[PDB]
Design a protein around this ligand. Structure first.
Ligand SMILES: NC(=O)[C@H]1CCC(=O)N(Cc2cc(Cl)c3c[nH]nc3c2)C1
Ligand SMILES: [Zn+2]
Length: 140
């Protein structure tokens, strides 16, 4: 589990969004595993605006924050799951790191802010859905 709270927005893994999120939907993309909904209170997160390939992510299955090197956001093939059939997920970044399905929502961060959230994993790899291109998250 996990969300990014920036301004009047809540950013979650699309497969984990709640009723209030779909009812107060701002933007969603099934191919990115992302959903953004509106909130009543202002959030205290800052979105990174950068091209960093190194950072730190939270892994709930290990209660630990791991430093990682990660790839550039790309269209990557993702195996079938209880939430999606086998498909290509866009804006995805991979790192060598531990992850389990319950780790989705864990934040990846660099010196400039939040880069993205855990969205995929398996075999010693961890995938993050990038949020740095969503410039509108910094306004209105
Ligand atoms: N973004 C996706 O397609 C997700 C949706 C939710 C979901 O359970 N998965 C499967 C999945 C996710 C993680 Cl993080 C794993 C770690 N080891 N094996 C894993 C398998 C894909
Ligand atoms: Zn950065």
């Amino acid at each position: 589990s996990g969300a990014i709270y920036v301004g009047n927005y809540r950013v979650v893994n699309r497969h984990l969004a709640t009723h209030n999120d779909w009812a107060n939907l701002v933007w969603e993309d099934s191919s990115r595993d992302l959903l953004v909904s509106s909130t009543t209170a202002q959030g205290c997160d800052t979105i990174a605006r950068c091209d960093c390939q190194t950072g730190v992510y939270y892994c709930s299955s290990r209660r630990k924050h791991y430093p990682v090197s990660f790839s550039k956001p790309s269209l990557i093939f993702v195996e079938a799951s209880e939430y999606y059939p086998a498909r290509y997920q866009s804006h995805l970044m991979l790192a060598v790191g531990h992850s389990e399905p319950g780790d989705c929502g864990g934040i990846l961060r660099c010196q400039h802010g939040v880069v993205g959230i855990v969205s995929t994993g398996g075999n010693g790899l961890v995938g993050f859905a990038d949020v740095r291109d969503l410039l509108w998250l910094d306004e209105e």
